[PDB]
Amino acid sequence: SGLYLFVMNIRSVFKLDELGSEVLRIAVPASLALAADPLASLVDTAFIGHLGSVEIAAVGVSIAIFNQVSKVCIYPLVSVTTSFVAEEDAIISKYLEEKKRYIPSVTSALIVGSFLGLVQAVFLIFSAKFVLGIMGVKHDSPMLEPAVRYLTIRSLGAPAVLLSLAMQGVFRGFKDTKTPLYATVVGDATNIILDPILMFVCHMGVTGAAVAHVISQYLITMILICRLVQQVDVIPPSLKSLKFGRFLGAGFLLLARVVAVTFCVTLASSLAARDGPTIMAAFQICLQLWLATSLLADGLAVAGQAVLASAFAKNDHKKVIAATSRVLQLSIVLGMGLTVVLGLFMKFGAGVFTSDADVINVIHKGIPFVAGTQTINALAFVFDGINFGAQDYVYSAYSMVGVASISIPCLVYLSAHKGFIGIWVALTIYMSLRTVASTWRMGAARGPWVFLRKA
């Protein structure tokens, strides 16, 4: 059994050797870029918070529209490209040939991102009134006008947004998270700078905030594409040299997988909402705490994926094994550390979020789940990176379908029976199912780990 990989070289968890330096070198910048958007967006939130009462709820619903539409079109387009570029960049016979280099995954991802980005752009421009009526914004309500304005304008950035996300998948294929991190920082500072200039000095309000974000997003796309064309070639030499069927298929497998994962969390929230606003608010806080702390290991999972995708591309079973073990031990360490920190923060900083004693008390009731399964969470996310470095997409798809089929009845039953604590028990069952699904793929020496029966 492949479970021994969890403890192999455990005297070298923190060693800054080639593997340790590389994993740290790939993982830390990605985490930083994932952490830079929330802070820059919170600065944006502040600027809009000084506009008016309708504008936040107007812009906020407009933003809620974008963020989910993207997450559908983000996770596949980036997790497929990080592996399909890291594969083709690791066997492209690269040598002292001067004529840069064409990678079909790089060209394929840019096309898919550009198409989806303009498609989302047009769609959210024309169905703005429609989606907003869907989004609980009444048509007679005052929110609808600035929401439509901000939505329609910010949808100009949708092409650049999805294109730069494809390019982050590309640059992750090259094991370069610094380039997306630099681009993200640059755009976010520019947007934090452009927000007061346009919203307030130009008297544009929600139009100003949207123009600030769109200009900054197109700057980030520009930065990424200049660095990307200087490193490799993005034009295909012939129109037949584009690997597309394989590309879109992994994307749709990962898209179906994400739909299931997000729907499990969607049901939990829609079930907590049926338990009074106190349970409503407390579960929402717990859930953001739960998931946000999992988002740290996301750079670690990218490093593991890129390294394993490059290594599986070169028949290098020895580094595959070392890197798998390394990121796995790092993930469990981070999970336990986040367990400690998040539990402590929840008990003594609930009052940072809410001024309600009831909400804080329910938050304190739920601390064990949100804090306990943090090691399960880190393992679940890092194994996704690992099994994506193994490029096991059909298993991911059908395994999450099964985890949801087991977890969704758990949610419904446990929630209606024991409310807040029952939803959290169900979510623990689901996360334990997730972790066990991914770990079985590796440890059982089945699929992309069949070679383990020979080591």
Numbering used by the authors: 56 to 510
The study reports:
HvAACT1, belonging to the MATE family, transports citrate from the root cells to the rhizosphere, where it chelates toxic Al ions externally, thereby conferring plants’ Al tolerance. While most structurally characterized MATE proteins transport cationic or aromatic substrates, HvAACT1 is unique in transporting anionic substrates. In general, MATE transporters share a common topology consisting of 12 transmembrane helices (TM), which form quasisymmetric lobes: the N-lobe (TM1-TM6) and the C-lobe (TM7-TM12). Our structure-based mutagenesis work identifies the citrate recognition and proton binding sites in HvAACT1, which are physically separated but functionally conjugated.
Here, we present the crystal structure of HvAACT1, a citrate MATE transporter from barley (Hordeum vulgare), in its outward-facing conformation at 3.2 Å resolution. Removing these regions (Δ1-56, Δ153-199) and introducing five-point mutations—C351A, C388L, T495V to enhance thermostability, along with R105H, R456S to reduce surface entropy—successfully enabled crystallization of a modified construct, hereinafter referred to as HvAACT1cryst. Functional assays in Xenopus oocytes confirmed that HvAACT1cryst retains citrate efflux activity comparable to the wild type, suggesting that the truncated N-terminal and L2-3 loop regions are not essential for citrate transport. The crystal structure of HvAACT1cryst adopts a typical V-shaped outward-facing conformation, similar to the previously reported MATE transporters. The twelve transmembrane helices of HvAACT1cryst form two distinct lobes: N-lobe (TM1-TM6) and C-lobe (TM7-TM12). These lobes make tight contacts on the intracellular side, sealing the transporter’s internal cavity from the cytoplasm for approximately 15 Å. The electrostatic surface potential of the inner cavity in HvAACT1cryst reveals a positively charged C-lobe, attributed to three basic residues: K126TM2, R358TM7, and R535TM12. Conversely, the N-lobe cavity is primarily negatively charged, owning to a cluster of four Asp residues (D92TM1, D99TM1, D289TM5, and D296TM5). Despite 0.1 M citrate in the crystallization buffer, no electron density corresponding to citrate was detected. In the HvAACT1cryst structure, D99TM1 forms a carboxyl–carboxylate interaction with D296TM5 at a distance of 2.7 Å, similar to the D41TM1/D184TM5 pair in PfMATE.
